[PDB]
Design a protein around this ligand. Sequence first.
Ligand SMILES: NCCC[C@H](N)CC(=O)N[C@@H]1[C@H](O)[C@@H](OC(N)=O)[C@@H](CO)O[C@H]1NC1=N[C@@H]2C(=O)NC[C@@H](O)[C@H]2N1
Lengths: 126, 82, 100, 100, 215, 136
Amino acid sequence: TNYGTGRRKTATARVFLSAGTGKLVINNRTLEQYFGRETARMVVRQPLELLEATEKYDLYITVKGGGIGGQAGAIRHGITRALIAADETLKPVLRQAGFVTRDAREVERKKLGLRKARKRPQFSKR
Amino acid sequence: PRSLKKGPFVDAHLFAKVEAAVASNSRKPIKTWSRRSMILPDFVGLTISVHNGRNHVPVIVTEHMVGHKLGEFAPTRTYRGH
Amino acid sequence: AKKGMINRELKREKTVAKYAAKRAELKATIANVNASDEERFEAMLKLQALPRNASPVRLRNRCGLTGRPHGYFRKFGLSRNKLRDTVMQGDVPGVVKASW
Amino acid sequence: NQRIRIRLKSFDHRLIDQSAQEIVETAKRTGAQVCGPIPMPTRIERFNVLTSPHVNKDARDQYEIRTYKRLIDIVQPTDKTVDALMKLDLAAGVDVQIAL
Amino acid sequence: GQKVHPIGIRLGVVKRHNANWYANPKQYAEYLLKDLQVREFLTKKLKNAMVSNILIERPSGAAKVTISTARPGIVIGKKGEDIEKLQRELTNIMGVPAQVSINEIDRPDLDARLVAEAIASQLEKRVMFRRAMKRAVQNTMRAGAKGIKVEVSGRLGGAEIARTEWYREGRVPLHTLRADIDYATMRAETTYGTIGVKVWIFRGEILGGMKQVMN
Amino acid sequence: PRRRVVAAREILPDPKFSSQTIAKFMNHVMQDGKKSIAESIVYGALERVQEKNKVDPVEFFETTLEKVRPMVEVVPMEVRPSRRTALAMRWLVDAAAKRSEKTMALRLAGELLDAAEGKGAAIKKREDVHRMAEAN
RNA sequence: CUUACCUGGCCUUGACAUACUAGAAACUUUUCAGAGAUGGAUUGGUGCCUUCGGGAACCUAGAUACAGGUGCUGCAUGGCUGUCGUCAGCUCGUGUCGUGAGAUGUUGGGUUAAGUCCCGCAACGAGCGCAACCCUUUUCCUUACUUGCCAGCAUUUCGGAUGGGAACUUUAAGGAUACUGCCAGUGACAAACUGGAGGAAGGCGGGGACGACGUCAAGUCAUCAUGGCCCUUACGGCCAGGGCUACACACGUGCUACAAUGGUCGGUACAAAGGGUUGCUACACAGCGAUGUGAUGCUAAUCUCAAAAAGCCGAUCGUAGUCCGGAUUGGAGUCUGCAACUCGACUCCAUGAAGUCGGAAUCGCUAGUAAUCGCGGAUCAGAAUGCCGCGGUGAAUACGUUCCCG
Ligand SMILES: NCCC[C@H](N)CC(=O)N[C@@H]1[C@H](O)[C@@H](OC(N)=O)[C@@H](CO)O[C@H]1NC1=N[C@@H]2C(=O)NC[C@@H](O)[C@H]2N1
């Protein structure tokens, strides 16, 4: 019934949160069949574990773009902002835990005369 | 190499000359610049002077040579050691 | 470039346009499967008997103003030296310095 | 089924916005219903041009040119609308295509 | 020590393009080549008519050439036959019907190219090079610009060793992108080789941005 | 840096144990950004030690790290606490690189086990460093 | 071809410009000799405007002024570029001091990334530089609802497929916001510095473009222009074949490895950016394969290149010059192209070299960075390990200025 939007490294997640009994679904798949690696699953589950309210909600999630880490970060951000839209008093705790900030780090462009963003070709005096 | 579905490539001015030589029995060498023409069975037993850049070197065609390009038997670079 | 090279390119471009239709027809005949193998073989011989400059494989893109054969940039038709000047003085529509 | 659809292309988004705004304002005058303008993704193409005449590979100008596009739909148009839009004056730097 | 082109750097920021047309990728090259031909032809044909700026428009299958001039009488002609003759010649060159519009400059001393042409003409008319640039500087400053810089380079005075002189008066903020700076270059052909002339003229800042310029 | 003072970055607690020291150990193991491979190695090394002797992995790791930590370095000077953990971790991972046994998980578990008792190239490194320090 | 070089075959007012003179529309077929350049025959056509006396287009023929030159001088030059170096400095007018070259201003205490800012002072005032205005990324709002989207309803072949909806993601134009603004210290109770709350973001948030007066007789007469010199039956122009790809050696910049944090096989997820009508191709059939044939959509938010790869799960290999490595060579082919011998790319079978982490020495990098994995483009018939871009995963370490370099 409440909505959140999360973003991280070209990935975008839209999260619908409602009252329920812990049913979580991402792109018509369960969490364990969607995210193969396990740190991603903790990253997804962190906001509800902090609030001790794992079993009090149902989550319907759709994510697009980026990779496995970025999508997990975007889902976490979306869950946090959905919870904040649900209750405004949880924002102090969520900000203290640090889930509210949008991570603005992104890939640096390649530059002329360089092999990468910063790496240079090997140099020689003679 | 050249695709099989196309067949062998031979220059027309060389082919007409070699066919005239076959029809007659001339033992005069044929003189050509066509390094890119491939040796056919009709070439066997003849003498072809192939250009190498500066001179025409003579090639006596045997049975084994059939299938190669004429320029394979007239090298273009000169090397004797350092 | 020298004037001779520029004129030589024009001569090649003229021959190509002169023989384009016949060359296309012969290639179509070669590709035709219904025609007899004898017909295809004669089509191949005529194609190989066409003059060398009729083949488009021998044209080389040159700068429209100077005739330079390196650094061509199809989209403008000019080599880099004249492209830079004409762009920087504001005569090429839409082109600006790029930053991102 | 009558629905005019118009596509605009340009190298300048200010000009393309001027044209699209003026077109929709013209159509509303005749009273038909308008959908749009819908901004379509922009095409960006980029070039690297050596600046020195002889030899400095790291000295380049980087130029870009952009193509902007807009799409408009006129639905349920009256008789006045078609000829009014066809009468509408053409502005330089903008290409307009009208389809039935 | 190498400086970016003052018009190129602020193209699309406060300054518009001299060419304004759209073309598909397969027509861009031919359109551009014919436009360059038109510019090269007009420069030679109006070498003595104080022409400064040429603007080319292609609305649809037609061309509009706007010539910014300070001698409209010479360009148009006594009866107006010259504009028709120019229109015919340009129509032949472009392969499409063409029309010409004249735009008269009111203050020639505020314009970069006219000043550079005057200095170059004097230099090949053998005036001492230091008088010409002082004359041009004070003429523009009295005409009411906010700054001007003039530069001449080459075998000045027919010397064996070439050198560079320059003279500036007022404000010339080259690094400020919104400044309205006009720039031109010319070649003076003398007995001893080529001399190069460069002029910068600053006429205040352009406020409001290209939104105000209405590009 | 000659101009200013940098702040050490904020590493995140491990997901499965919630241990910053274990997360740092993973970062020391990882190469080429393969966090999953590093995590697999660390967990495989922990489970072997847990099975061969039944202790809680977090406490066992902390206690072994405390044994391996060196008190003096490189003219002795005194180490800061963070350098203690860094040096101990780097010695701990380096020894398993040269050890016998085929796989790296067991290669690391062997060092973890033997360092608890007191035999291992990691502890010999601390021994030699302290011999040098006491010499000077 | 490019091509400027070599061998040989050819032309001479020239392949190209203008002026003078005469004749032919211009053009077009077919054929022969030759390696071709060239030469000789054979056809058809004979056109447009026109105070129609002719003119225009175009060619040919003759004549001389000339054309032509990637020939030389970057130490005669223009234009353009590198470098100190994104270093923080560099100058002027009017006063005053000194016989004079000159000085002062611009110096001294703090502070900053900075000649950035505050205070004092025979100095009083200005200009170019520094910052800012420009592009891009991070949060929110308005306009816009298709070719893009699918939360609520309905159908369903369970494919946004369909009726629909305008919510959300996105697309892309215009705006808002961050200013030491507020709180606590500090300073001289100046400038400025250090902590905290709110906030997507806090002290210059990240990246790009923008290069001061000048130096190096730095680079470029082979992009182009240009003074002077030089060749003009040849240092100019046309052609075929060869060379720029040579090979006792030496150096620079890279790619692939030397394996188990790995190799092979099976199953199975998640991107961004860009290209496509002489083009990209769904699908089917043939082939072990590169590819071939038929056929379908697309001038593209519509169809296509297109398979992301590393990742996850299962099996196997068990430290061996190996199921590591993939050089070299024999055989058989595909495609582009008039033509792959010198001298192309790719496919299949066979072969299976050096290499087990590299001496003295030396290089890059301070965060979405290094490392590692794949994807695209310009040039281009074909021919990238180079160049220019795009995203995925994602570290370690900074006590400090004693030494090296600037
Ligand atoms: N491949 C080389 C071709 C030959 C050159 N192009 C000829 C050239 O340039 N001569 C120039 C020229 O006469 C002129 O200079 C200008 N600018 O006209 C003068 C004025 O200095 O200087 C000459 N040169 C010098 N060099 C020497 C030097 O440096 N010190 C000592 C003395 O001998 C110097 N002079």
